[PDB]
From a paper:
The caseinolytic protease P (ClpP) subunit is a compartmentalized structure with two stacked heptameric rings that form a central chamber containing 14 identical catalytic sites sequestered by two protective axial pores. In any case, even the degradation of small oligopeptides depends on some structural factors, and the most important one is the orientation and positioning of the catalytic triads formed by Ser98, His123, and Asp17224.
The superimposition of both tetradecameric structures displays that the complex is slightly more extended than the apo SeClpP, and the Cα RMSD is 1.63 Å for 1451 atoms. Despite the similarity between the overall structures and the high homology between amino acid sequences of ClpPs from different species, a closer look into the monomers exhibits a difference in the Gly-rich region. A comparative analysis with the native SeClpP, the SeClpP-ixazomib complex, and SaClpP Y63A29 structures revealed that the Asn42 side chain in the complex, as well as in the mutant, is shifted to the “down” position (the hydroxyl group is approx. 5 Å distant from Tyr21). It indicates that the boronate compound can control the conformation of the axial pores, even if not bound to the hydrophobic pockets. Based on the previous discussion, here we show an allosteric activation caused by the inhibitor ixazomib.
Numbering used by the authors:
A (entry chain C), B (entry chain I), C (entry chain H), E (entry chain M), F (entry chain J), G (entry chain D), ...: 4 to 7, 18 to 192
D (entry chain N): 4 to 8, 17 to 192
J (entry chain B): 4 to 6, 18 to 192
Write the structure that this text describes.
């Protein structure tokens, strides 16, 4: 809200992006646009992505994820408060070695959620889709954390809360940022 | 509504059951109860089940279906107006040779419909359930009509409307009742 | 509402059925049940069906129509107030020579109405269904009135209101009942 | 609501050939009134029927189901307005056997033109307009016959809501007598 | 609610009518019907009308009022609890000398209330109607109470609450019924 | 709905109880009352409990369950349509050897569901309660089916649908009732 | 949301258009206006259209589609997150050789959806319209992908989800943009 | 939405007006104001009116139509996406020879729609009004297309969809703008 | 909506006021303020008031009307689209000789509309008010048009639609502005 | 509301106003203001005024961990009410620089939440919120000097404290007199 530029525009000048909400299509379109703009300004300097998010749309999250992996600058990820669901997926997506959480930040991982209505045939199509989406997410999370796909699958069957230290041990982040 | 007994109680005295609504658990509980009662009164005399129904719950319909096949009396089925979805399934369930439709009655067959909300795992469970339910329905309908399961599957992919004459050719009924 | 039996049960004792509402599945189930009961009581005496109805479901109306043509007794139809849409179709369905309207009663004929929502394929299925239903209705109305199918089609494209005298000239009734 | 020795109060009065029209006139009300008229005639085709009318009006076609049944059956139907006969209620009041149409002294009668609605294409609005205008002509012609007023006077006097005292209703020809105590 | 007949049917056997609600068309229909029935049973014995009512429709109240004045039996009126607006008008309408209130019963008189919506011309018609209705009510109340029309007009401009004793002094009742 | 007694009262005369709805406190109150009454009429003759139910309240179901085990008569259970959740628990509760399902009836088992809201302390109390309730249900189901508690726990983690034949192999019923 | 110009206005300076929402008339009016403006600024430099969209109105999508094909500059299309329904149609509409998806982006194709209410005649008109619209879409998609119209028809009967790699095989895009 | 001026203000600098929504009084006020302003800036240079509109108010559309015919500059009309109802009327209103549609744009023509409530007299007034409005529209459309008034009347009785090529053959536009 | 100033502010620079909506208190306050401002800028140059309005509040309209008659500059009125009810009253209020309508613009005149709810006395007060307001409007309209008050009264009893040419012959405008 | 807006003008003097419930948007703004103030000057004190009924635990921890992360001392000043997570953040200011005005109110209590679904899911939610309560109690114990046992007992129900009681408790260091 405050003016200095608004406060977030002022931090964007220093290559800081604030992801502080649910991840929907509008949020992703803004974050992607900020990433593309920061890269056009300087393709060498690190970007800093702060993440306080309960999660959101899988496809919106993948728009952000693929943009992070596409652009030349390293994107550091810093979890403050909560990175849950697609929020923890994006936290794990930062440049390897530059993924952080503050000491009391919380990380939560779980499987995708959705809904389906209609004919048996359509419910089948929706089920196959969301199951294939879960496999895609598990494969990527396996690669970013070093855990096996089997372990990822087991650990996301239900809501799984992790402390910052547990998130580091898991491979979701690299360091807990001490004061 | 009118009194003679109410009009439907008066027809139940003559072993006539009127199924004239959507099939839910309360409707099934009444129809099943009327079938059990008619059998306890006389285990040999035919029962007459008039069907004007847009369909309804698969399990409620199977409560009626299995009761028809369980009891000793033959249950004749007479379609007036419309037998759609589970209504056409119950029409096909009458005693072989005693399944009828009036000349302008309409029959409609299609696949089950449902919904599923939650985790990928739960959507998978719901999808497998409704697909297995569709196979159960197709196998039984194949047995009652003489059509192959593959033909039943094709012919129910979308809403399939049949005239009374087409319903007889299909094997859903035995005779069109002429005036 | 009043008691004598309720007033309609008292008239049913004299083989009078009152159709005084929209035609839905519950109304059709009651009327069909009253017709079957009157026939079981006496298969030769006339039945009298008074019709004051704005219309309703096509399949519910056909449950009544096919029952009229099925049973042995003649069913006289008497229009009081309004027979519109499926109400005028059932008025035309009485025993030939025994279809009446009171002098200020109104008759209205028009084409079926419906709705369709979903994929192009499903909208196509619904369109073919309602068009085939319109052809079925026109063919029957042509046979009951003596008008050609082409004329019926033309005269039902929009709401077409007829006086009792016009309804007699049209062939929808046989006589205007004078005082 | 109350019960008499077993009858509800209206069923008890129907035994004496009294029908109570005490509500809006819709299809269910007309169905009941028509059924009571047919039943009273089947019981005795010669004795008068008494139709009390306290009604704000209602559906034109429902009212005509009642009107044509009154004119069809052999018994005379007396009409007695208590409280209000408005719109189709005043039309049915005027429909009683000539000489046997009454209102109590403080009863109110109101006459006006039909009301409706139309929605859709220009063509459909045209069809609905022609229908309701033809219905108004039908109502005016009948009311002209029942009251002795000209159709042009009926048309003028129903352009807007027109309230009449019982005495004015008698002078108009809508009733024959104000029933004094 | 209780059965002894329901409780009100049992009191109707003793020529007691209970007016214990808002006066609308259904209430008036019932009260008028009870009055006509009591007169047909015995045209010479008094009727007792208990009144606990907040008022209601003017025309519904006049259906009751004119029926009271029409029938041969005297109708005593007994106010218990409250007779307000059209309720106090009907209380004043009992047989002169036989209008009562219990000692703590409340009587309220005021002018008619209504609404009008539409063209200036229609609002004018509605205004003239309700003003003429107020004059009719004042003239009758003047003759039942002995007060002048001017005084009635002045005393009903706003809600005017009266004790039972004040109602007797006003002429609305004849006696306060002591224990 | 129909009268012969209503249809269910007529079957209660033959010691048949119809459980055809969701199990809440009113349903349990009625079923318990019917069981107590049937026992008071004859403490030696079998009772027949038909079950078509999606489930319901655990405590309402236990009111029925404990009443079944308390009374002297054997209670046969017959699944028609659907016995799900507490419905399948009550199906398994019939007299051993007298638990049935019709061939197309469906059985579903799963773990309890609930909600909790308030302070951490209150959420803890609610969690311990529902977990202890699940252990109680598993222990009883283990006794009634012969499966181990561990297997019951694994098989109820998610919605688990069983055919009638699968329900018999599981130990939930004793026989599939063939036609 | 952020200011640098808003972030999207800043990217429009570099000939980047962000389509990140459902496609309705307002979205199309903006995109068309941005295309016309970019062409007026420079008729030879490429335009970049990022697409993250669940789809939307067919006619709104065709306003965008025909504008792309009208203007002189090549329009590259880049799918991030999701291009579904009309979104995947516009993705396929980019300059041939310049249609991209990021590796985890999702593409979905299916047939048009709509609704129709009214007379049989009007439902027929609406059905013919949406079927002709589907043929128009299939013909164009056939041209843009190289698949036959029959294959397009078969592959869009139900929701058909494609990975980026599958979308390239299909001909909807030319390249998956690797990091 | 985007900034350069907003995108539409930037195109207005080049004498381009974007009509991309329903036509109501606010839309007409804006379009009329833009037309008057463009004429005041230069009374000779062409104006370009892009039309993507489902239609709207007849009087709002005539405010735009009469302003087009009043001002000195030619107004070219370009249909993108859909010009339906009053949208197709305004498309036909462009300077003769300068009325265009893009190849996949859709044109729809039909008769006016409205509603009327109240007294018979008021419904008559509303009916005469909308019928006279339809004649006014048909006369003008006849003049702009070269079709007879009777053909216009027949072709607008129901929703009539036209391709761009059909719209040119009809006389609603002069050219389909090829790429 | 568009910027050049917004489009309406740009036209206000040329002494053009756009009345393109319902007339309520906020609209009147703005129009009055624009009139006062234009007069303060130049007390001799004409003002141009475009009117496309369905009408609105009588007192809001009189705030505008009295301001027009108060200020020194002539106010030309130009009807585009529709001037109905208070909109046609303000159209008639322009400087005599400078009141215009475009050829297809519609003018409608009728009597005031309102509502009243409460005691008879209050309904009387409201009726007298709206009738006196109608007389005030008729007297002014009589002066502005040259028609007698009795003709104005007859011609406004119901909705009265006029073409531009009819409005000129009536005296509501002076000229139809041809192209 | 008034005009910089009034809060932007105070941010120029390193004053942050936390005057609402603490949700994710509020935390994102406060965190952003803290990061910005530190980037402007990593030495000068920041002043955080707190009038808040509380809010989300994780949103509050985003603010809390940012306070402890940055180099500048963050003074906390309670005006009106610091309740629940608001009182937790008040206790989080630089030791010696935690204040309340004399009539300000402080309230402490345990976390609140909800859980719907299977027994297994209710168990997961219960363990989560209980572990969150332990985390909050441990931190509050360190910031106040009270034992974890005492914190647990004093937060079982809503516990209202005057400013003076809050100082005695260790939630603040000083009551700011006029
Ligand atoms: B989460 O942030 O809650 C989660 C993300 C993954 C990492 C666990 N989000 C969802 O599950 C949201 N669901 C969807 O985007 C979705 C996906 C699919 Cl494939 C189908 C429907 C829905 Cl709604
Ligand atoms: B129909 O009558 O419309 C149809 C029955 C078969 C014969 C096509 N009804 C349904 O499919 C109703 N659906 C279910 O009973 C159902 C609902 C849900 Cl949420 C999940 C599974 C099932 Cl099987
Ligand atoms: B009418 O009573 O208004 C009319 C009947 C015919 C005689 C004109 N009723 C309907 O058209 C109601 N429509 C349907 O019952 C129907 C039929 C079909 Cl085939 C498809 C959809 C619907 Cl909704
Ligand atoms: B009144 O009883 O209120 C009146 C009857 C006549 C005597 C004035 N009722 C109506 O005008 C309404 N009744 C209709 O039957 C009607 C409704 C509609 Cl929407 C259209 C036409 C008709 Cl004719
Ligand atoms: B009272 O019961 O509250 C009162 C009657 C008094 C004056 C005796 N009732 C009403 O005023 C109720 N109003 C009407 O019945 C009415 C009358 C008229 Cl004339 C017009 C409209 C209405 Cl709504
Ligand atoms: B089922 O009938 O759907 C199921 C019981 C099965 C698992 C035997 N029902 C429920 O879980 C319904 N839940 C409760 O009655 C309940 C139980 C407890 Cl212990 C706490 C809360 C609730 Cl809401
Ligand atoms: B999609 O984006 O979901 C889809 C477009 C095609 C490419 C599959 N959208 C629609 O089908 C939306 N439907 C329409 O625009 C439409 C609606 C109606 Cl009622 C009638 C016709 C059409 Cl063409
Ligand atoms: B359309 O754009 O959907 C259509 C335009 C004509 C050219 C086919 N619009 C309408 O018909 C909207 N109707 C009106 O503006 C209108 C006109 C009249 Cl004269 C009376 C009522 C209404 Cl609502
Ligand atoms: B019209 O704009 O629809 C019309 C104005 C006259 C010229 C016909 N509007 C109204 O009548 C709106 N009504 C009022 O402003 C009004 C006036 C009075 Cl006196 C009392 C109540 C109301 Cl609501
Ligand atoms: B308070 O601000 O009201 C309180 C904070 C603590 C210090 C007492 N807030 C809450 O308890 C709000 N609850 C949550 O943030 C929460 C936490 C957990 Cl672990 C689970 C669910 C919820 Cl909703």
């Amino acid at each position: 809200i405050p003016t200095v530029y608004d406060i977030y525009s002022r931090l964007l000048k220093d290559r800081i992006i604030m992801l502080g909400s649910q991840i929907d299509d509008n949020v992703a379109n803004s974050i992607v646009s900020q990433l593309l703009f920061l890269q056009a300004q300087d393709s060498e300097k690190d970007i800093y992505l702060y993440i306080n998010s309960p999660g959101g749309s899988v496809t919106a999250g993948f728009a952000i994820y693929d943009t992070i992996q596409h652009i030349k600058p390293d994107v550091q990820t810093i979890c403050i408060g909560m990175a849950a669901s697609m929020g923890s997926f994006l936290l794990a997506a930062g440049a390897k070695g530059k993924r952080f959480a503050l000491p009391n930040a919380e990380v939560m991982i779980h499987q995708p959620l959705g809904g389906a209505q209609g004919q048996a045939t359509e419910i089948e199509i929706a089920a196959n889709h969301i199951l294939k989406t879960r496999e895609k997410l598990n494969r990527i999370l396996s690669e970013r954390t070093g855990q096996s796909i089997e372990k990822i699958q087991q650990d996301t069957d239900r809501d799984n809360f992790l402390t910052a230290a547990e998130a580091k041990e898991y491979g979701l982040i690299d360091e807990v940022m001490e004061p």
